[PDB]
Amino acid sequence: MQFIDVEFPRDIAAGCQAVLTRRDEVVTLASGREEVNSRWADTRRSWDAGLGVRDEADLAQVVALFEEVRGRLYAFRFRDWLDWRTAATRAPITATDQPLGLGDGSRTAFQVVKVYGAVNPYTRPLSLPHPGTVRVALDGVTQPSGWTLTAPGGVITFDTPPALGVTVTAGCSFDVPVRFSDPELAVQWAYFREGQAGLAQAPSIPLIEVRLDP
Amino acid sequence: MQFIDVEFPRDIAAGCQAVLTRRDEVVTLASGREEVNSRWADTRRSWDAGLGVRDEADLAQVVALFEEVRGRLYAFRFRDWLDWRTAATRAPITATDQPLGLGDGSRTAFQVVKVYGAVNPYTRPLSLPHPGTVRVALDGVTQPSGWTLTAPGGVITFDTPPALGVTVTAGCSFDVPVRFSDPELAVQWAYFREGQAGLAQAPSIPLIEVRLDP
Amino acid sequence: MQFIDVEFPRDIAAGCQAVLTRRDEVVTLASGREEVNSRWADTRRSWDAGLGVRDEADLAQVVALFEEVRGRLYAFRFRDWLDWRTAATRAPITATDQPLGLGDGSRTAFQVVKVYGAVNPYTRPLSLPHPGTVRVALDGVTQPSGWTLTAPGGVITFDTPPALGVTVTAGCSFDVPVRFSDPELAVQWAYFREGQAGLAQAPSIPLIEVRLDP
Amino acid sequence: MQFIDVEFPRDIAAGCQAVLTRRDEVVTLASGREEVNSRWADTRRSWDAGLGVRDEADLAQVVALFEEVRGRLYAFRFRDWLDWRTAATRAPITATDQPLGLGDGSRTAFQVVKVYGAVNPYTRPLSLPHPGTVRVALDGVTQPSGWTLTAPGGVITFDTPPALGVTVTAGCSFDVPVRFSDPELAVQWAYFREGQAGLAQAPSIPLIEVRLDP
Amino acid sequence: MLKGKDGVVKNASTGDSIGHLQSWALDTQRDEVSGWGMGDDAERAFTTVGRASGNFEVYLDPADPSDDLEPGDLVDLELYPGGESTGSGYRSVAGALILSTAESASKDGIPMLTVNWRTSGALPQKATVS
Amino acid sequence: MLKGKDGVVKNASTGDSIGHLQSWALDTQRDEVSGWGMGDDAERAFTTVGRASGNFEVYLDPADPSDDLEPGDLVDLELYPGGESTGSGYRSVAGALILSTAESASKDGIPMLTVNWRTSGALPQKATVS
Amino acid sequence: MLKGKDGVVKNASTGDSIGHLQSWALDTQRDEVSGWGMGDDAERAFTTVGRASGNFEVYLDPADPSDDLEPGDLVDLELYPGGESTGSGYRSVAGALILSTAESASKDGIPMLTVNWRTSGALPQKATVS
Amino acid sequence: MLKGKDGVVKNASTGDSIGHLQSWALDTQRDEVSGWGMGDDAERAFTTVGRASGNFEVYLDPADPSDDLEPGDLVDLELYPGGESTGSGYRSVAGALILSTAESASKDGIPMLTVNWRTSGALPQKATVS
Amino acid sequence: MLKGKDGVVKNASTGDSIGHLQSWALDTQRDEVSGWGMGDDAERAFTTVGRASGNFEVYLDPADPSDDLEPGDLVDLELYPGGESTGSGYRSVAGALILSTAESASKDGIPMLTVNWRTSGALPQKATVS
């Protein structure tokens, strides 16, 4: 659907944990017999947040932000450090770093796709390319204008479809969609005022990377 | 079956702990007479892994391997140091160290087997023998060639069957098929960015050496 | 039955735990009313082993040994330090130390019996007398040849039955029969190679002294 | 009923827990709807004792005392430090400190009542006024003789009822009735003799302040 | 810097100095909590509670205000590091609780009284006596 | 090597020296994580957080900027190890938070102020005075 | 037994000695595990992983390679206990992370730089420079 | 009583002295289990496992057998407390495992090698050199 | 007070003094438990188990009774602080368990035997030898 794009602050994200959620196993009889069930479209990522708040005012800001969606209305924009770099944490992401695909002369639209693994890679389309990190490249030359990027879509549309034999390569930061796992939020704030405290971390704020249904 | 050949990196294999499970028991009355009933598939090895990742980028490579398997399509190869040496970890592994069996003049094929014991050794067939560590020795002399190892099979086939009363001695490294117990993958990555990190070890990943049902 | 006699190494036994298992309770109403149910032939001993392995090679040896029985086939021979000495840990066991019984002129066979307690002693026949610690004594003199010891039986048979009035006294080390309580074995070995570790203790290897039904 | 008055030693009382027990909540739908159920006559207190025993001989005395009631026969007299003072721990209790009520010219009897709270105070009648701390006061003057105090009753009866307009004020120490919550008592005494120990804190002695039905 | 000879601990409540005094100590501590997001170069620190303690060393005497003072006494203190002279900074301590008193000496040694106080629910005020 | 007698520890915020000063301490500590490997000989080190703690020793005076600097004060420090003399490397501490001050002296001893500061999520900059 | 004056810590990466060093420290440690089956006279001991750390003391200077060095810097080190002379044993350290730098001095004291390093994922090689 | 200057700490396995030794330490430690019951006035102690640890100090030299020795080396030691003179009590340490080596010296200081060893489950034998 | 030169540790079991002894130590400790009701001014204390330990320092010698003694030996001891002279208080230790022996020396230092014992299941009796 249209969804909602609401940024999750990177500093709060610094505190946030990372776990990998994968499905499709359900094997057969445990006599050494194995059958691969396919759930389909899996590889979501699990996270717990609020640990990056640092101080009470910031904690208030995230809490207000959670209230803004009133319980994860539609989508929520989450900055993922791991997916942000197509290349490496110490290596700059480039258009060439991630291969979108090859134009066939009719392929106007390419979704940004993250290929993970090599022999049998799983490709993840990215709902929101982080703005300004999106660079399009063609085998002949890095591609500039004429590519229409649908930021909500994650699809880049060449006005003139690339002819057969030119590789489309695009690398961008990943603003992943997230839906909070639990409505309940644990508030660790440390009383301020005369106490003048405030809390660096707020526990129990689980979120799940959500593969939004289009 | 042929399965999927994906090697578990030895470096990632560094540090894992294992448990041995036997399926033969089913005892009788409290008279002190106990009957052992065996349903087979005994002595499977359960492994908790992900140790020794060192950094998040390296961890990402393991994660990519998990993505490549996609919920363990078919089977996944794991390298076990303990079984890699036919003899002892310090000791050299030689063709002489493991004796495959004796030819009858028609025994072209010999399975690579690890005999666990003396009086009644439990034999572990080796599905995958690591290539190049395979040394075959006929009773008369070491055999340079003519033994056709089927890497998926674990069977070495002499073009000319060894004659009656001829010992065959073969020693090789052990590669074992493993199927992950849990679809979900736990991740210890240690946040980088300003507080640069990269966890030394990921949390235990349950992967089970599985004796595949024939 | 015939059973199997397979030695358990003393060093591994050094790590092994000792607990006492006794039955025959099942009392009546808890108004202070007590009734003694008799399970019969009890007093087994509980043990947990593997803590005496010391190093990886030795750990492999016990594991292979467990595989040899393929899940406690029949009996297993366990060295028990506590029962080894008819006398004391600091005092040498002697034929005189344990009293087998008195020959009646027809009593050719005497099972080695360990009498525990005094006024109402429970006597435990020993399935396997440790070889070479078996000494036969008669009231007149220590008895040498002519006694046929059935090592599996634990019975010593005088070819000429001792006449009435001579006490048969025999003290020997106890190679007690054991059956592993659990098929599952925990393997703790500590990675070797560059790490060069190896583990002194392996947990979770329970065994139960088994009073074999003959 | 008549009940039993058996003193609980103050030293044992020194080592005693205090928890406020209150009832009458049972609210309705969790739509933010609240209904106040009324259990009636609540505000009991919960205590755990034995931490004040100090030594084996004293511990024996409390145990004997528990045996005396043979399981909380009727009432048990408990010294409550918190309610002992009608004023403050650091301020002396006075007749004026606690207001019994106002005589109407027919009000011969006044139960000692502890008013807790102000706008909507709950008043607790006291079964046993500690002897000698009971002082009666009238608005004109502190009242001496002619008031008949029923020690079990907690009621003070003026022979000539106080006329309208004189405030009856009485403050006394509170010997609260107690009934042990659990018949079982844990004994921590520390063996004496050669050890010569003894224990200051017997654990798990549970008592509940009891508002006896009269 | 002053002299320290001028510095005198006077029990404010008594209105007189505690006695012949070997030394005076005052420490004011404000603890802080430092917190950082995992991706943080440095940890932000915020102060939480300020509490103070002090110890004064005296020579034990039967006729000493310090001897009269006992452990468990919440007593106001008037340290006068600059002394009672005009324009001298002095520390006024309110309700300092005397944690303990140590009376110890060797045959050679003169009896020594060591008294330590921690102000309770208060922080010493560095007033100036002029 | 510098002299240090000429060295001035002065407030970056007030702009003036704390007082007569015996000593200055600045330590920058970066915590690290060991990359332990089983079956591997050595562990790699990754540095996660850097924080700065320091203590400057002053002589306690009623008329002292150091006296003015109470524990719990977040103040920037312009520390000149080589002093204000030009070309001396100097540490521009930012937002140091004073943790504790100890005012302790014997009768013989001159009153002393020990002031300890820890950073508030900022790192001192080792600039060179022009 | 070297003189030790000859010993010089040189930052391998800079290619020059760190500075006017006061002292150099190198320690190599291999951890071990000892286990005995109960009832064993002695516990068998096997060495596990080996890691090393070292500390070098320098005089703090604006123009110092050591000053340029920062905490959290993975820096190659070339200690030269025998010096650069022919047939002199020297310790080559690769990628030694600098755990912390301490800059502290008293007015009397010259500014002192204390730098501590722990080699990361490596064991120092006792090579001979000839 | 023996002199100890003449004492030779020599490697049993190599057969030669480690170097210019400064000191030798050998300690045999036997742990004990002490048990008492509340009805019993005293605790009975029974010695259990025994292990040996020691450190020998040497002057660090490039051409040193001690330099050749490394942490994680299992080497036997023919330690002679009274030296090689016959009849001196001598400890035939067996399979001592070197735990760590220290190589720290100031510019003034002579490089020193501190070698610490712990046993591998073996007990040194106090034989007399003959 | 005696002299201490007179004090000699003699092994009761061997009937002879251990050797040239630098020092002798005996400590007797009776542990206590203190418990108070929550409303208690002070905590009542009752003594429990009594155990003793001692250490004797000797010069290591091949011909020494102390050298013959080993860790883990339950050996009776006869400390004679007053000596064997008439009316001299002495401590008779029964079944003291040797815990450890330290044999250590520097090249300058004479080899030293340090032996520590803890009596097992017994408390030394302060008998008088006359």
Numbering used by the authors:
A (entry chain L), B (entry chain K), C (entry chain J), D (entry chain H): 1 to 214
E (entry chain E), F (entry chain F), G (entry chain A), H (entry chain B), I (entry chain C): 1 to 130
The authors write:
We recently characterized a novel roseophage, vB_DshS-R4C (R4C), that could infect the Dinoroseobacter shibae DFL12T, a ubiquitous group of Gram-negative α-proteobacteria of the Roseobacter clade. Here, we report the atomic capsid and in-situ structures of the tail machine of the marine siphophage, vB_DshS-R4C (R4C), which infects Roseobacter. The R4C virion, comprising 12 distinct structural protein components, has a unique five-fold vertex of the icosahedral capsid that allows genome delivery. In this study, we use cryo-electron microscopy (cryo-EM) and structure prediction to determine the atomic structure of the phage R4C capsid and the in-situ structure of the tail machinery to characterize the distinguished long rigid tail.
The distal ends of the R4C tails were re-extracted and resolved by imposing C3 symmetry, resulting in a 4.5-Å structure containing a C6 distal tail (Dit), a C3 baseplate module, and three C3 tail fibre trimers. Below the Dit is the baseplate, consisting of 3 hub proteins (vBDshSR4C_014), 3 megatron proteins (vBDshSR4C_016) and 9 fibre proteins (vBDshSR4C_017). The R4C distal tail—attaching the tail tube upward and the baseplate downward—is a C6 hexamer, as revealed by C3 reconstruction. Short loops from two adjacent monomers, and the α1 and β2-α2 loops interact with the long loop of a tail tube monomer. The Dit long loop adopts an L-shaped β-hairpin belt to create a flexible surface for optimal binding of the baseplate, mediating symmetry mismatch between the C6 Dit hexamer and the C3 megatron-hub complex. The overall R4C baseplate is homologous to that of RcGTA and both comprise hub (35.5% sequence identity), megatron (39.6% sequence identity), and fibre (30.4% sequence identity) proteins. The ion-binding domain, which comprises two discrete segments, uses four conserved Cys residues to coordinate an iron-sulfur cluster, which is essential for tail assembly and phage biological activity. The megatron protein is divided into six domains: iris/penetration (1–45), adhesion-like (46–211), peripheral, carbohydrate-binding (482–629), central (904–1130) and fibre-binding domains (1131–1447). The three α1 helices from the three megatron proteins form an iris-like gate in a closed state (inner diameter, ~10 Å) that resembles that of RcGTA36; this structure aids in preventing the eruption of genomic DNA. Each of the three tripod-like trimeric fibre complexes is formed by a combination of three tail fibre monomers, in which the head (1–35), body (36–117), and foot (118–230) regions are referred to as the rod, knob, and foot domains, respectively. Accordingly, the R4C phage equips various carbohydrate-binding accessories, including the Dit insertion domain, the megatron carbohydrate-binding and peripheral domains, the hub oligosaccharide-binding domain and the fibre foot domain to attach to the bacteria capsule.
